[PDB]
Amino acid sequence: SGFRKMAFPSGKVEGCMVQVTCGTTTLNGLWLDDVVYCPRHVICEDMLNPNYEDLLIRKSNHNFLVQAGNVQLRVIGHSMQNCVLKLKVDTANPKTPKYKFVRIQPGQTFSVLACYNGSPSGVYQCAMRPNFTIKGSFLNGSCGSVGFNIDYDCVSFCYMHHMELPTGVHAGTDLEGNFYGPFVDRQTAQAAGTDTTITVNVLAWLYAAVINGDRWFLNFTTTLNDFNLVAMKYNYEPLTQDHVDILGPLSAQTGIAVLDMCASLKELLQNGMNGRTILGSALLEDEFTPFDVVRQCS
């Protein structure tokens, strides 16, 4: 019983964080096999309008200092892929877990291991927003921290932190260096664009609430089309038959039809929560996927 924002155990990722220093810039890197991955702005004052190609040409292998705890790595190769720097080192990380690199979809969640100077300081869960930002918790020095999921023994790396926008939300790349969203690694104004609420995740959280005994919001039914009208009015993502199918296991376990749950959600959107709480929250929570609910309620 109980429902919490739960991160994955971070041990397997803790073993791969290192510090990367270039000139006087220092940030975090990810050491997997014999490759270290970090944001290419480690090579930047220059960040206002950088020519990354030109700046990397002034660099040689020995200009990159890589420290794994108290262990110094020997950099024997370096290349740029999209917005990540890849540093070939002479040693394979003995702590390399089984892993993959994944580009997650908006709405999916992942655990963030926040790191400074190559040392982990905290773990927390968050979601890729529909507008490809994340609402993280990061201070200067946190660049190169990574987000991940764990399936059995395999770590799926999906996020490397690059930037805090002036609005205070965060932007980064997948581990091949492609930004999520329209962002570029330059210190210049950048619009994120309208965000929306992750509808399928809010429904999954209503199912979690029912599983936990919070039932007051159950009431009617609706149509996929009728609901999507109300979704649009309150800046919720449109619900698709694909989303309905993903909620099937929770619908089967609770006995509540998905469109019945949509009808509950519609009444909460149209009438507010009335000072009451659901799973300890006075707002509709959208950062639990259907998988997160099943994991934590299974």
Ligand X SMILES: Cc1scnc1COc1cc(Cl)cc(-c2cc(-c3c[nH]c(=O)[nH]c3=O)cn(-c3cccnc3)c2=O)c1
Interface positions with ligand X (CB under 6 A): 25-27, 41, 47, 138-143, 162-166, 185-190
By a kind-dependent CB cut-off of 5 to 8 A, residue 3 interacts, out of its own copies, ligand X, none, with: its own copies
Tell me which residue has tokens 């707002």: 283
The single residue among 10, 197, 251, 264 that binds its own copies, judged by CB under 8 A, is 10
Taking the least distance from each CB to its own copies, the nearer of 124 and 179 is 124
First to last CA, the chain: 10
CB of 121 to ligand X, least distance (A): 13
Q: What is the DSSP letter of 106?
A: T
The total number of residues shown for the chain amounts to 298
Taking the least distance from each CB to its own copies, the nearer of 12 and 78 is 12
By a kind-dependent CB cut-off of 5 to 8 A, residue 232 interacts, out of its own copies, ligand X, none, with: none
What dihedral angle (degrees, nearest 10) is formed by the CA atoms of 234, 240, 242, 245? 80
Separation between Cα atoms, residue 158 and residue 37, nearest integer Å: 13
CB of 54 to ligand X, least distance (A): 15
Total residues at interface with its own copies (CB under 8 A): 42
Which span (77-85, 96-104, 173-181, 273-281) binds its own copies, by CB under 8 A? 273-281
Separation between Cα atoms, residue 88 and residue 75, nearest integer Å: 6
By a kind-dependent CB cut-off of 5 to 8 A, residue 168 interacts, out of ligand X, its own copies, none, with: its own copies
Contact 22, 43 (CB under 8 A): yes
Q: Which strand (E) or helix (H) includes residue 84?
A: strand 84-89
The single residue among 18, 113, 231, 258 that binds its own copies, judged by CB under 8 A, is 113
Give the residue among 28, 46, 47 at the shortest CA–CA distance from 38. Answer: 28
Other CB atoms within 10 A of residue 56 CB: 17
Residues contributing to the site for its own copies (CB under 8 A) = 1-12, 14-15, 113-114, 120-124, 126, 135-139, 164, 168-170, 212-213, 277, 280-283, 295-298
